[PDB]
Amino acid sequence: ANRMILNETAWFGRGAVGALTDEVKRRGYQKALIVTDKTLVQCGVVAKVTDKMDAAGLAWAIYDGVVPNPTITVVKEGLGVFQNSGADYLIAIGGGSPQDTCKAIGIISNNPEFADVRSLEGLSPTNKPSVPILAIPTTAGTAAEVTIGYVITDEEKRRKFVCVDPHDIPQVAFIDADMMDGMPPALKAATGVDALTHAIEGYITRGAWALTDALHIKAIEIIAGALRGSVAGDKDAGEEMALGQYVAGMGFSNVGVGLVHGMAHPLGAFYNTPHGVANAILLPHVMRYNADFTGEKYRDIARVMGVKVEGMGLEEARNAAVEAVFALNRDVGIPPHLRDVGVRKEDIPALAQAALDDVCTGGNPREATLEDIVELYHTAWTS
Amino acid sequence: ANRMILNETAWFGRGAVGALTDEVKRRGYQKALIVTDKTLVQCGVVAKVTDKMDAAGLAWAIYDGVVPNPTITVVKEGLGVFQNSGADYLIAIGGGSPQDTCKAIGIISNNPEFADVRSLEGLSPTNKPSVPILAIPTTAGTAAEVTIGYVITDEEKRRKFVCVDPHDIPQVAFIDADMMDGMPPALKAATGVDALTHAIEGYITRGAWALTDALHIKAIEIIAGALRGSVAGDKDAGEEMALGQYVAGMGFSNVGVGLVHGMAHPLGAFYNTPHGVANAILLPHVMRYNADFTGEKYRDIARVMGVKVEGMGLEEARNAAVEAVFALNRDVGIPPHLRDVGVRKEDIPALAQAALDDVCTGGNPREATLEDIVELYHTAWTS
Numbered sequence: 001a002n003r004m005i006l007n008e009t010a011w012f013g014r015g016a017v018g019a020l021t022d023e024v025k026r027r028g029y030q031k032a033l034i035v036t037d038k039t040l041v042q043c044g045v046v047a048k049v050t051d052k053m054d055a056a057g058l059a060w061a062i063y064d065g066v067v068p069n070p071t072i073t074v075v076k077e078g079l080g081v082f083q084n085s086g087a088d089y090l091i092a093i094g095g096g097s098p099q100d101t102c103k104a105i106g107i108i109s110n111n112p113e114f115a116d117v118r119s120l121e122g123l124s125p126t127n128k129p130s131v132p133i134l135a136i137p138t139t140a141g142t143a144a145e146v147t148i149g150y151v152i153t154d155e156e157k158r159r160k161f162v163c164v165d166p167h168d169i170p171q172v173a174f175i176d177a178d179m180m181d182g183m184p185p186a187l188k189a190a191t192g193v194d195a196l197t198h199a200i201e202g203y204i205t206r207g208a209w210a211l212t213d214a215l216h217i218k219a220i221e222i223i224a225g226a227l228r229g230s231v232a233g234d235k236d237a238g239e240e241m242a243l244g245q246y247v248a249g250m251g252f253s254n255v256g257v258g259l260v261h262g263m264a265h266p267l268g269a270f271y272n273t274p275h276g277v278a279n280a281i282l283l284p285h286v287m288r289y290n291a292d293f294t295g296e297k298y299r300d301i302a303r304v305m306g307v308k309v310e311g312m313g314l315e316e317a318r319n320a321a322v323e324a325v326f327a328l329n330r331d332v333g334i335p336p337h338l339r340d341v342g343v344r345k346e347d348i349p350a351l352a353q354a355a356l357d358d359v360c361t362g363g364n365p366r367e368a369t370l371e372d373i374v375e376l377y378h379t380a381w382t383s
Numbered sequence: 384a385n386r387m388i389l390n391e392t393a394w395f396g397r398g399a400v401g402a403l404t405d406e407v408k409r410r411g412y413q414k415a416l417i418v419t420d421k422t423l424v425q426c427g428v429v430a431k432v433t434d435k436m437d438a439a440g441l442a443w444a445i446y447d448g449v450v451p452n453p454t455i456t457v458v459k460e461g462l463g464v465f466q467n468s469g470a471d472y473l474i475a476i477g478g479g480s481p482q483d484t485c486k487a488i489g490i491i492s493n494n495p496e497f498a499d500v501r502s503l504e505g506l507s508p509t510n511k512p513s514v515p516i517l518a519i520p521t522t523a524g525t526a527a528e529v530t531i532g533y534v535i536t537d538e539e540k541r542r543k544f545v546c547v548d549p550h551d552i553p554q555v556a557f558i559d560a561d562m563m564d565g566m567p568p569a570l571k572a573a574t575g576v577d578a579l580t581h582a583i584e585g586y587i588t589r590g591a592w593a594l595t596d597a598l599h600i601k602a603i604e605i606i607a608g609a610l611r612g613s614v615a616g617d618k619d620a621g622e623e624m625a626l627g628q629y630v631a632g633m634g635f636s637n638v639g640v641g642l643v644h645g646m647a648h649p650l651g652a653f654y655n656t657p658h659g660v661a662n663a664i665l666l667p668h669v670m671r672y673n674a675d676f677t678g679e680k681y682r683d684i685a686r687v688m689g690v691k692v693e694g695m696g697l698e699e700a701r702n703a704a705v706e707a708v709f710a711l712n713r714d715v716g717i718p719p720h721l722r723d724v725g726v727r728k729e730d731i732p733a734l735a736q737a738a739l740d741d742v743c744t745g746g747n748p749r750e751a752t753l754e755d756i757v758e759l760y761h762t763a764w765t766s
């Protein structure tokens with residue numbers, strides 16, 4: 001049998017954060033700890049929520065110590081602030097980095113034996129549900145509001161580790177493009193191709209079945225339809241992106257992804273590479289590697305990305321899908337090679353070993369060796 | 384902004400009830416009341432769960448007093464057993480009738496002021512969640528396991544009333560075709576077209592939006608593909624129906640249905656007509672009537688029901704959508720006329736009034752008048 005973890009309650013559309021104060025009152029919670037980052041505070045995005053909480057008369061403290069590719073130190077610091085604050089619930093406001101940090105804090109608080117943080121890696125054997133989380137994404141990106149996965153950086157061991165736990169599922173998700181509009185075009189592109197990567201990897205993942213197939217092929221159609229428009233400042237396309245990224249979440253959380261995420265994670269660990277930029281550069285090269293092990297599925301990807309596949313042979317349709325991704329990356333301004341984002345040639349062996357051991361690689365529909373991954377890094381590295 | 388209530392946890396596929404004993408142990412629950420009917424006990428369907436519970440040493444009691452179109456009397460009786468059972472959670476085993484009875488019991492148990500049952504009608508103003516419910520459907524049919532609506536028969540007022548309450552959502556759903564196989568062909572046919580009615584009405588309902596559109600159109604595709612096979616005893620067909628009927632639920636719960644359900648409920652109240660048969664006979668007639676208020680959506684329906692809709696204009700396509708429904712009904716042995724199932728012509732005015740006042744009607748994409756519902760009943764009634 002196949003398990004699906006989803007949000008019991010989610011609110012969708014511009015003004016969705018409007019529903020937060022009523023949801024909190026209904027659940028009888030006392031005091032929030034908002035988990036977020038310096039930018040989202042300074043930019044006024046956090047105030048969009050806190051102003052409504054102030055008006056509703058709902059108490060909150062804040063932790064904005066989160067940095068991109070959040071570290072063990074960031075988690076431990078956040079858990080301390082959560083403890084000193086007297087909060088009884090969590091509000092995650094931001095992208096994957098603040099939301100993953102929130103999940104770790106929420107989990108360790110009710111599962112104190114995991115306080116070293118790195119011991120959460122894998123299928124965390126937690127006995128207790130997280131401290132309730134209310135989740136408000138600010139990127140059109142990670143779907144952390146609906147997934148059971150979170151990614152923390154172990155700096156001592158220079159690796160990103162994936163934690164997978166149904167106990168970390170937020171009680172309510174607020175998916176509001178008014179929280180997303182501040183994203184610089186480059187961030188919309190990076191988080192948008194992260195979402196496309198979730199949906200493409202999820203579509204072809206080893207554990208894929210009919211329900212996740214339906215969710216993923218819909219997310220690919222929405223994301224591929226909307227991302228250029230959203231990067232160009234189109235407000236309706238940003239709302240479409242907000243839905244597409246979430247629908248990708250509903251799928252990949254529950255079945256897995258593949259070698260793109262496997263190879264992206266060590267780039268974050270080694271260089272602090274933005275996760276979506278890493279995914280974006282790797283994705284077409286990994287799709288090529290995986291192509292002959294995906295059955296009819298690249299035909300579907302090509303069709304909902306705007307290719308006429310009607311009279312195409314299967315290998316022709318597979319190339320069309322790969323080229324459609326190279327073209328999207330070009331159109332939204334992601335550079336074509338890993339060298340362009342500062343990946344060192346010397347590091348490929350260590351990166352390849354880290355990728356081989358990443359939790360995500362297990363879902364890849366083609367079984368990757370060390371030599372395959374070394375070669376993929378090289379192919380993606382330069383022309 | 385649009386709200387989605389879904390199951391936080393759900394298990395899908397043949398053998399999915401195998402996940403029940405672990406879900407109960409992880410939630411620390413001490414004793415179930417199983418809410419079901421005598422037919423499911425008799426056929427050993429209930430034993431498929433209680434045998435697994437016995438092996439895991441999990442305590443249960445049974446209430447099997449549920450009848451089709453469950454009554455205020457049945458709810459009060461089951462409630463009485465729950466209170467004297469010492470149970471701390473519920474397992475609903477059966478179609479809509481047990482699952483809806485189970486939700487009424489679980490709501491009233493934790494919201495005792497609703498003991499008269501009829502005070503639940505509409506957006507039930509409950510302050511507390513239901514007693515936790517684990518939902519196991521045995522028809523390929525109502526999606527009661529994932530919806531927030533339940534339907535009780537008021538015998539003194541001769542009407543079915545809808546109770547809509549986020550507090551009633553089951554904690555875990557187990558969607559297991561093995562629990563469904565024993566449906567007589569006629570029951571697979573009726574519940575299957577109920578599922579199709581949810582998906583079609585959900586797709587064209589007034590509250591419809593992007594997420595519910597994608598769920599409903601996918602559910603129409605799965606059900607149109609699978610239903611003939613499942614009725615004829617095909618294993619895989621039955622598993623596809625089990626998924627499709629659930630996917631329809633994920634949508635219609637959250638946005639509504641229309642005049643088919645509005646007109647079906649009075650037939651249940653007046654004659655105890657099976658819900659699915661009532662929906663089946665009415666569906667193609669009401670689609671016809673709605674056609675001109677559904678923009679392009681009947682184009683999409685005809686397509687996913689296997690009609691080459693390429694050359695066609697909007698009215699060609701609209702009519703093909705309707706005939707695709709007409710044909711499916713015939714093939715699965717559904718009476719094509721209301722007079723076949725003992726609907727009396729004299730009652731049509733009274734039925735029309737009840738249908739105009741049924742909440743499901745409010746979601747209908749075309750705003751119905753009394754005389755329109757009178758005419759639709761007459762159309763659906765004759766040979």
Ligand SMILES: Nc1ncnc2c1ncn2[C@@H]1O[C@H](COP(=O)(O)OP(=O)(O)OC[C@H]2O[C@@H](O)[C@H](O)[C@@H]2O)[C@@H](O)[C@H]1O
Pocket residue numbers: 037038039040043045067068069070094095096097098100138139141142151179180181182183184187191194268275276
């Ligand atoms: N609406 C916004 N407007 C402006 N800047 C924003 C906005 N939302 C986020 N940012 C900024 O974008 C930068 C990247 O934020 P992240 O949270 O790191 O981005 P995201 O891609 O959503 O999350 C990545 C993280 O999630 C994991 O899945 C992944 O492994 C990685 O750790 C930060 O400086 C953040 O302040």
Ligand SMILES: Nc1ncnc2c1ncn2[C@@H]1O[C@H](COP(=O)(O)OP(=O)(O)OC[C@H]2O[C@@H](O)[C@H](O)[C@@H]2O)[C@@H](O)[C@H]1O
Pocket residue numbers: 420421422423426428450451452453477478479480481483521522524525534543562563564565566567570574577651658659
């Ligand atoms: N697996 C099965 N095998 C054999 N018989 C079965 C099975 N499942 C159900 N039945 C029998 O089918 C009959 C109809 O069962 P219901 O639960 O009434 O059917 P369903 O269509 O699932 O629910 C209808 C109810 O749901 C509401 O949406 C609607 O208003 C109505 O009250 C009953 O006699 C029941 O015992």
Ligand SMILES: [Fe+3]
Pocket residue numbers: 142194198261275
């Ligand atoms: Fe990702």
Ligand SMILES: [Fe+3]
Pocket residue numbers: 525577580581644658662
């Ligand atoms: Fe129904």
